[PDB]
Amino acid sequence: VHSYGYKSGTRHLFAKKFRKHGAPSVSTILTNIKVGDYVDVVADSAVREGMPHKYYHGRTGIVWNVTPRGVGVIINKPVRTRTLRKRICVRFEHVRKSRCQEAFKAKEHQFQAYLAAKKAGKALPPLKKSSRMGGIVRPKNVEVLARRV
Amino acid sequence: MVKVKSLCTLQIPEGVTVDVKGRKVTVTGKRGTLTKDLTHLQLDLRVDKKNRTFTVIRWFGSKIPIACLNTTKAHVQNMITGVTKGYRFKVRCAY
Amino acid sequence: MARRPSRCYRFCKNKPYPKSRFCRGVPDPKIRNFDIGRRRATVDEFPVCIHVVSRELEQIASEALEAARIQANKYMVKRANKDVFHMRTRAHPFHVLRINKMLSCAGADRLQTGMRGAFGKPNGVCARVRIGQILLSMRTKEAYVPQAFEALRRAKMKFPGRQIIVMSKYWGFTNILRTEYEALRDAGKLEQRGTHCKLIAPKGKITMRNVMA
Amino acid sequence: KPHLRHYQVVGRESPSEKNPEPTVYKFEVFAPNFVVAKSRFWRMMRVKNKVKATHGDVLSCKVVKDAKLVARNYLVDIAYYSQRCGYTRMVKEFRDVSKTGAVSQAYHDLASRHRARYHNIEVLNVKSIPD
RNA sequence: GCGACGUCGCUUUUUGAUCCUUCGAUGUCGGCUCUUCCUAACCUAGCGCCGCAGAAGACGCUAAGGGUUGGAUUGUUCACCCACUGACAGGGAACGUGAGCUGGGUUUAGACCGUCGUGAGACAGGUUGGUUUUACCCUACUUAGCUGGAAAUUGCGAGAA
RNA sequence: UCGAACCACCUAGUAGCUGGUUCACAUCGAAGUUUCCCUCAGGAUAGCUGGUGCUAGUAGAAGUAUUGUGCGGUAAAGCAUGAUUAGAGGUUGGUGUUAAUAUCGACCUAUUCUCACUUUAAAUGUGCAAACAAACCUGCCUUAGCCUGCAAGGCCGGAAAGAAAUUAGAGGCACCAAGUGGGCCUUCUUCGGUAAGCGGAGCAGGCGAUGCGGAAUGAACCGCUUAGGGAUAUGUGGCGUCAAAACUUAUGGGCUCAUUCGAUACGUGAAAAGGGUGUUGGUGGAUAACAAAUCCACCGGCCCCGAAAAUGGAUGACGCUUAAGCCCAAUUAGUGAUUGCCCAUUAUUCCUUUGGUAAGGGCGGAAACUUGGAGAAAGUGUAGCCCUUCCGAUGUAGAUGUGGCCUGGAGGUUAGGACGAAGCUUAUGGCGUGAGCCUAAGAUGGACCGGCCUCUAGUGCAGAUCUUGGUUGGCG
Numbered sequence A: 001v002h003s004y005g006y007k008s009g010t011r012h013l014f015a016k017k018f019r020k021h022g023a024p025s026v027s028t029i030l031t032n033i034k035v036g037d038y039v040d041v042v043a044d045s046a047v048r049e050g051m052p053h054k055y056y057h058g059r060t061g062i063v064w065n066v067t068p069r070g071v072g073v074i075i076n077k078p079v080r081t082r083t084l085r086k087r088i089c090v091r092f093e094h095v096r097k098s099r100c101q102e103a104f105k106a107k108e109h110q111f112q113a114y115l116a117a118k119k120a121g122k123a124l125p126p127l128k129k130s131s132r133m134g135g136i137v138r139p140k141n142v143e144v145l146a147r148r149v
Numbered sequence B: 001m002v003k004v005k006s007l008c009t010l011q012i013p014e015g016v017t018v019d020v021k022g023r024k025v026t027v028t029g030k031r032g033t034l035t036k037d038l039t040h041l042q043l044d045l046r047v048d049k050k051n052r053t054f055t056v057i058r059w060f061g062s063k064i065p066i067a068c069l070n071t072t073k074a075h076v077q078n079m080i081t082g083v084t085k086g087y088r089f090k091v092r093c094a095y
Numbered sequence C: 001m002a003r004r005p006s007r008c009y010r011f012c013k014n015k016p017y018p019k020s021r022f023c024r025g026v027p028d029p030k031i032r033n034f035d036i037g038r039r040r041a042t043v044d045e046f047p048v049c050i051h052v053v054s055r056e057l058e059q060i061a062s063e064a065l066e067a068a069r070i071q072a073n074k075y076m077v078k079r080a081n082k083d084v085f086h087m088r089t090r091a092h093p094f095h096v097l098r099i100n101k102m103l104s105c106a107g108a109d110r111l112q113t114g115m116r117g118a119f120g121k122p123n124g125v126c127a128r129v130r131i132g133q134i135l136l137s138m139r140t141k142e143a144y145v146p147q148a149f150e151a152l153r154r155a156k157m158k159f160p161g162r163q164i165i166v167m168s169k170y171w172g173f174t175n176i177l178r179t180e181y182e183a184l185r186d187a188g189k190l191e192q193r194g195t196h197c198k199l200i201a202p203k204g205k206i207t208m209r210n211v212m213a
Numbered sequence D: 001k002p003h004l005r006h007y008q009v010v011g012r013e014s015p016s017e018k019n020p021e022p023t024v025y026k027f028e029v030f031a032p033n034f035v036v037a038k039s040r041f042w043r044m045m046r047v048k049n050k051v052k053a054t055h056g057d058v059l060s061c062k063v064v065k066d067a068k069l070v071a072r073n074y075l076v077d078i079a080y081y082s083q084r085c086g087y088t089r090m091v092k093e094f095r096d097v098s099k100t101g102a103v104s105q106a107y108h109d110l111a112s113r114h115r116a117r118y119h120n121i122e123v124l125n126v127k128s129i130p131d
Numbered sequence E: 001g002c003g004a005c006g007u008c009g010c011u012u013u014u015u016g017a018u019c020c021u022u023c024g025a026u027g028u029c030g031g032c033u034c035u036u037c038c039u040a041a042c043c044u045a046g047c048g049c050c051g052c053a054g055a056a057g058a059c060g061c062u063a064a065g066g067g068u069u070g071g072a073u074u075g076u077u078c079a080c081c082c083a084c085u086g087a088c089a090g091g092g093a094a095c096g097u098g099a100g101c102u103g104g105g106u107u108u109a110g111a112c113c114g115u116c117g118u119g120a121g122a123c124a125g126g127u128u129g130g131u132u133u134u135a136c137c138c139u140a141c142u143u144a145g146c147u148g149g150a151a152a153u154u155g156c157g158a159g160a161a
Numbered sequence F: 001u002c003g004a005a006c007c008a009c010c011u012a013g014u015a016g017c018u019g020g021u022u023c024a025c026a027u028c029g030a031a032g033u034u035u036c037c038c039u040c041a042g043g044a045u046a047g048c049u050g051g052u053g054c055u056a057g058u059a060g061a062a063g064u065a066u067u068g069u070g071c072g073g074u075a076a077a078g079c080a081u082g083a084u085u086a087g088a089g090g091u092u093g094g095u096g097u098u099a100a101u102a103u104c105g106a107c108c109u110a111u112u113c114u115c116a117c118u119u120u121a122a123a124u125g126u127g128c129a130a131a132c133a134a135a136c137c138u139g140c141c142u143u144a145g146c147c148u149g150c151a152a153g154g155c156c157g158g159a160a161a162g163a164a165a166u167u168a169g170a171g172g173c174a175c176c177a178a179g180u181g182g183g184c185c186u187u188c189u190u191c192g193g194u195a196a197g198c199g200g201a202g203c204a205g206g207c208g209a210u211g212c213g214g215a216a217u218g219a220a221c222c223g224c225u226u227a228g229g230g231a232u233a234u235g236u237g238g239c240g241u242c243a244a245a246a247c248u249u250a251u252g253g254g255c256u257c258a259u260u261c262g263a264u265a266c267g268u269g270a271a272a273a274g275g276g277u278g279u280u281g282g283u284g285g286a287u288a289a290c291a292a293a294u295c296c297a298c299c300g301g302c303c304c305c306g307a308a309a310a311u312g313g314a315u316g317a318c319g320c321u322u323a324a325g326c327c328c329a330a331u332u333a334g335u336g337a338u339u340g341c342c343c344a345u346u347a348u349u350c351c352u353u354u355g356g357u358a359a360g361g362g363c364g365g366a367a368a369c370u371u372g373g374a375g376a377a378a379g380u381g382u383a384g385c386c387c388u389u390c391c392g393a394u395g396u397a398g399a400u401g402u403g404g405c406c407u408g409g410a411g412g413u414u415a416g417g418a419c420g421a422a423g424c425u426u427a428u429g430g431c432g433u434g435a436g437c438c439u440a441a442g443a444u445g446g447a448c449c450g451g452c453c454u455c456u457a458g459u460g461c462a463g464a465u466c467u468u469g470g471u472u473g474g475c476g
């Protein structure tokens, strides 16, 4: 237990990736965050001022606080028998706007717009077709298999 | 593993008569007589006629069951030969 | 008898230790003269280039391949010539070795060292073989192939562990079969580089325009 | 009475979202069951075709009927694995009635003398011999 | 016959570890005494084999059956010589063996010395002097009796070398 | 009695240490870890656990997947930071040479050999989100932002549905309190060590705390996990005798002879190369002659030697060898499609208990041929209010409950006793799962005392080198 500093065992974790170093994006500076959206707290180095502790690196969570240049993010931390909603304070560059809901952001956007189209809408344009069923399949090349040595 | 190769035969001329009784061999002649035992695996000695042919068939076979057949062939001919011809043994010394 | 007969390192119970900024007092291995024989030798000389690839994850020390560098060598003159053979060794003792020498005299007896201050210091070097390691490759004629079923077995029995001869269908330092190789010289597909040579591959460049100007 | 019936297992590779009509692969395997036939159907395609049992579907496995029960010769090109000389093939011409019968003797001979058992054993060319 | 180089199996009367058993006690080495066991054979015993003519050695294998000493110095184990001998082989048995002996070495409390320490004292350094209890119990063994006993004390239960 | 006497007293000195700590059943039931400690034989604090709960809780559920969506740099890989280096020969030093020459280093090259450093490079992971306000169509207000309206916050009503699987074995807190804080083994991988039945770790499982079944034998392995019984059927393991089962299978395919064969995993590993002129298998390549067939080389064991000890000696024993060994298969015999067969604290089913406060239904008078109950009381708890229904049932430390057991005594009540009380004896039964109670019969006893509701405590003993008394063995 000789060393347990705030940045311990983190050579490869905060190290920038191969052939992508230097200053942060202009997207990451032109992001727009509110109190409530989700963010991937992907601590990048090359800013080295506002990086969170190692633990909060693959972690995503609500933004409970947006200061001028520091996003405050709550993150669930399974301590021992309970999770703490930790309240980390990082700068914006250590933050992505988390996709994690486009799975149903973009689903119910067109899913309702066609459920409405299917319930009332204007008309019901036919959609994606069935996937798994039978069929009298016609082959196009026969083959066999014994060995290759 | 196991196979069959051939059959072994010996002819029994005049002056020599061979039996088959208790699967044993009796050979006599006009110079001497001798009888002995030749049992082995798959080696059942049966003489067809009294003076026709000494036959020893085996039905199974491998290196060991077949390296034991024609030794009775090596040990039946000298029964028929010793009772008519005989083999003398000589001994010498030096000083 | 005073040094552990290279058996207590037949298994990779430990990491690899490289000669590096970590170890600084590493001694010298006695295997140095890897190549023997005809030296500037060209490539079209010998038809057969047989390998010698191991079988298990054994671990041979610096002391058995060093004689294979000589044992598997010397039997040339007794049944062949040196200049009719390529003796090139294709390994090196990289894994530097520690040693713990217990029972010091500075202190008490049988209670001085109760397992502390008792880690390693340099003694020598050995190797890690895994399944598929070439010990000592061979190049030869046709009338000189069955030579070192002895010389190898002379040194295969100097080794800890066993070994085999690997009859090959390659043209040595190239990736070409023998049967088609006599056909490739008929159309000059392969070039030369000294004691070895390089293959003109597909995707050929406009550079080597070898035709008359 | 001889176990290890002869199965005719055939199958595509779940067509396809990429190729939309992958070539069909059929081969005949001796197996106790058909679950064991499909288990060794999806071992050939996983190896000889790089197709998973997941990303493909079995079209129609089938039990070959028989040959008129009568003795005849059989040379069975068989390939087993073992720490006993890894991956050696063999010929071992047997004389049994049906292909199911002779290949049975093939397995009970290798497991007898090489201790190579069912999953360490591939089979090829279960054909007959006139003379 | 082994020796370069080497390596590879199996070795404890081995050098140490390990800390598993023992801290309401498995009593310390060596001997004495006595019994056993193993062979990796020291002797005798059996052929074998050589540049084994006799002589006489030479290499080897088979055999644990029998045999393997008396002393001087040492507490010793070991070692060393002395001398006999056919030769004086190597081991286990809780480094066989103290409710068997011994008490020489370890061995404390006395004392002296050397070095150490300011000192009390320390030394696995030397020297000298220094307890050795109990079987009358169970089994083991050793001899010494007695008495039951065959459905091994019972059924009538029935089997005759 | 003396490296500080002896007596009495403080004093029942203190002890993180050792030993002991007295009834039953029921309901649950762990921990050897975190941090802090002159702390590492102990504490405190969390976790684990019990009890009491509170509360609107198919949800703020999940040791699980799916779907999207992030994350990572270990395995494998590959050799730029490094290598490691010699093999082919040719700028920079010294030098052996006759401006001509090398010579080894540095270098120069095509490389090379095999490693830690390299790369979004795995598997396994893990972070998130996923349907009634997460999208809309709207409208508030202070407007904070920015020059009316956007966007923003706290809001909001009109309206919104799903054409992320499963379990959906109910969510949420709260309180009080123990015990534990010496773990060990193991799988997977892996740090240190010559090694280990070694030390230190990660993961999960176990044991501890736990039997049962069988691997002869074993805390841990393999099955299975545990209320009392019966049956049916299996698991692991087996079916020659011991030993239930092939009364030695109608067994089938080969293998195997072994002068210590071989034979159940993990026990610890059994045997390592090496060869042969050996028994069985396979591939390369001749002759049509070996001394009508016979070869030159190897792959593969079963098997032969290599190889060895000390009480007598172990597959577990016998024994087996045209197996009862080994490897494959079988399962009523190529006749026609199933379970050959034997063993459990497992499974199924059947009764019986008991808990759940688990659901129900009655919770005061009627009939099915003979009795019982859909008439036994509004009830936590029993000799249950009555039925019947589901489910669970092991357990050390610990916790808790009991209309629960027992001893001494008190307040009440009911009641015995010279026609024999307490006590005491037990082949005296019965009845309660049990603690225990009641009875009988005493060729016992002689004068006190039982049940029930409360109260009360000097209240239960096998074990403390317990204390006291008595006896006993050894023992004539």
Ligand SMILES: [Mg+2]
Residues within 6 Å of the ligand: none
């Ligand atoms: Mg002694």
Ligand SMILES: [Mg+2]
Residues within 6 Å of the ligand: none
């Ligand atoms: Mg004397």
Ligand SMILES: [Mg+2]
Residues within 6 Å of the ligand: E139
């Ligand atoms: Mg006695």
Ligand SMILES: [Mg+2]
Residues within 6 Å of the ligand: none
């Ligand atoms: Mg790697």
Ligand SMILES: [Mg+2]
Residues within 6 Å of the ligand: none
């Ligand atoms: Mg998870």
Ligand SMILES: [Mg+2]
Residues within 6 Å of the ligand: none
């Ligand atoms: Mg168990």
Ligand SMILES: [Mg+2]
Residues within 6 Å of the ligand: F215
């Ligand atoms: Mg066993």
Ligand SMILES: [Mg+2]
Residues within 6 Å of the ligand: none
């Ligand atoms: Mg039954």
Ligand SMILES: [Mg+2]
Residues within 6 Å of the ligand: none
């Ligand atoms: Mg058989």
Ligand SMILES: [Mg+2]
Residues within 6 Å of the ligand: F408, F458
């Ligand atoms: Mg009292």
Ligand SMILES: [Mg+2]
Residues within 6 Å of the ligand: F458
């Ligand atoms: Mg008391």
Ligand SMILES: [Mg+2]
Residues within 6 Å of the ligand: none
């Ligand atoms: Mg008492």
Ligand SMILES: [Mg+2]
Residues within 6 Å of the ligand: none
């Ligand atoms: Mg007592």
